[PDB]
């Protein structure tokens, strides 16, 4: 299927401390592979997956130089946007940047993206053509003019279409064992009496990778949304994911209901039934 | 591998 490489850079203002807190993380698909924390002692980009550990010192020196430089421009941007919005130096604010590239299942370039947010709201983004910007308000218009005049989109489009997609492919290969695996969901059903007239059936998917999964309930072969609920997919902490979907049913009718599971690691969609 | 060497300010 498709794959993505994405980098995430958060900086939080802290009036009364020396500098903002800056945290960067990189991911291939759903797997984290590097981090940087401005407050930590090492002052280096650090490995967070086994397959990037094989990268040599030139890689690590460069990645660390780039991420440290990025912490300084986030720091400046916090001051600039504060000024743009005429906001007090007393408050804490946030800047966020994310960028990345996707490849298809053929592993060719599918798309690139770059988005920036101030206080958790869209500020400026690169459009999908990778040539133009969308600005949320007049402040962001001042930024956009600055970035057009500097030819930022050209630099970024060269990277997104070339380097980003090349190194993604490099990582998919070097981490093939863990990154190109699919772990099929372990699947079971649960039952609890809720109300004298009713019971909950909960269909579980466990230890799966990637995170993408769909769980649906049917009654008599007919999709249900009423009295259903689906939890947000959650990390297990070991590289795999979990999810469940529940339905409450009139008690005595459990056999009308069926839970349906689709995941890339399943040759065919699973159907589960409560078996008392 | 990150875009670099670095970013323009906002």
């Amino acid at each position, epitope marked *: 299927g498709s794959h993505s490489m994405r980098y995430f850079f958060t900086s939080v203002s802290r009036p009364g401390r020396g500098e903002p807190r800056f945290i960067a993380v990189g991911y291939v698909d759903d797997t984290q592979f590097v981090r940087f924390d401005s407050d930590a002692a090492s002052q280096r980009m650090e490995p967070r997956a086994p397959w990037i550990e094989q990268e040599g010192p030139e890689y690590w020196d460069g990645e660390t130089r780039k991420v440290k*430089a990025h912490s300084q421009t986030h720091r400046v941007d916090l001051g600039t946007l504060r000024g743009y919005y005429n906001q007090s130096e007393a408050g804490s604010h946030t800047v966020q940047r994310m960028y990345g590239c996707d490849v298809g299942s053929d592993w060719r370039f599918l798309r690139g993206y770059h988005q920036y947010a101030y206080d958790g709201k869209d500020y400026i983004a690169l459009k999908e053509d990778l040539r133009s910007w969308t600005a949320a308000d007049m402040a962001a218009q001042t930024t956009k003019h600055k970035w057009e005049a500097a030819h930022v989109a050209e630099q970024l489009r060269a990277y997104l279409e070339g380097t980003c997609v090349e190194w993604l492919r490099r990582y998919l290969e070097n981490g093939k064992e863990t990154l190109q695996r699919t772990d099929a969901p372990k699947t079971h059903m649960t039952h609890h009496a809720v109300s004298d007239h009713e019971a909950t059936l909960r269909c579980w998917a466990l230890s799966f990778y990637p995170a993408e999964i769909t769980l649906t309930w049917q009654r008599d072969g007919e999709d249900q949304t009423q009295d259903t609920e689906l939890v947000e997919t959650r990390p297990a902490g070991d590289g795999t994911f979990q999810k469940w979907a529940a339905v409450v049913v009139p008690s005595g009718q459990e056999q009308r209901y069926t839970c349906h599971v689709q995941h890339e690691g399943l040759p065919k969609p699973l159907t589960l039934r409560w078996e008392p | 591998r990150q875009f670099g*060497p*670095d*970013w323009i300010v906002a």
Partner: T-cell receptor, first 109, second 118 residues
């Protein structure tokens, strides 16, 4: 690391001059040329990103990333082109430039 | 027009064993600052550069006796202590901005010509 022949080159006014550098590190992606007059600082002439060719007046800079070979051509050379010519290059992890050792050109009036 | 990069001193002739201080004021508004040296033996080479007053790449700094600081956006110093004859060179300061660096432009000062004598 970048190799550059020191010359000196001596050419008559009006000649085409060819300067070049060779490099080893395939991570280099930005390639520049400078002129420096003796006892002064370096002045950028031409800059190229992609493996490819750029003209500006009498100057043409070229890069061949397969051969790792870059060159600068000066058409219709003038006495005032008499200078040391340096090439420089970098990647995208740092603004640090690596320079060749320079080639001295004397254009004879 | 506006000042370009100003370096000082223009010339320094000094005995080895002493401390030498090279100074640079970058063009006002510029937020990158580069220190280079140039010698007959080793050519033209970057010692260090700063962005927003912080050292980004010092891989070209000699491992002993050289120190570079940028205490504020208008002033950088490079110090050598104790100096040695092999430190003799022309030292150049340059400044720039992101949008200029993306076209490989930087602005050079006039240089400090340093001779350290036995």
């Amino acid at each position: 690391e970048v190799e550059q022949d020191p010359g000196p080159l001596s050419v008559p006014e009006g000649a085409i001059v060819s300067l070049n550098c060779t490099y080893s590190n395939s991570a280099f992606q930005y390639f520049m040329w400078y002129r420096q007059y003796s006892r002064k600082g370096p002045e950028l002439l031409m800059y190229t990103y992609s493996s490819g060719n750029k003209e500006d007046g009498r100057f043409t800079a070229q890069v061949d990333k397969s051969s790792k070979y870059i060159s600068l051509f000066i058409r219709d050379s003038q006495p005032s082109d008499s200078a040391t010519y340096l090439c420089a290059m970098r990647g995208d992890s740092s603004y640090k430039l690596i320079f060749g050792s320079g080639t001295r050109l004397l254009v004879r009036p | 027009m506006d000042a370009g990069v100003i370096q000082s001193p223009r010339h320094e002739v000094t005995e080895m064993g002493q401390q030498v201080t090279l100074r640079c004021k970058p063009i006002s508004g510029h937020d990158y600052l580069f220190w280079y040296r140039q010698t007959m033996m080793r050519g033209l080479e970057l010692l260090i550069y700063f962005n927003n007053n912080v050292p980004i790449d010092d891989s070209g700094m000699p491992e002993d006796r050289f120190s570079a600081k940028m205490p504020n956006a208008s002033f950088s110093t490079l110090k050598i202590q104790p100096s040695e004859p092999r430190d003799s060179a022309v030292y150049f300061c340059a400044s720039s901005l992101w949008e200029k660096l993306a076209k490989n432009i930087q602005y050079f000062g006039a240089g400090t010509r340093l001779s350290v004598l036995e």
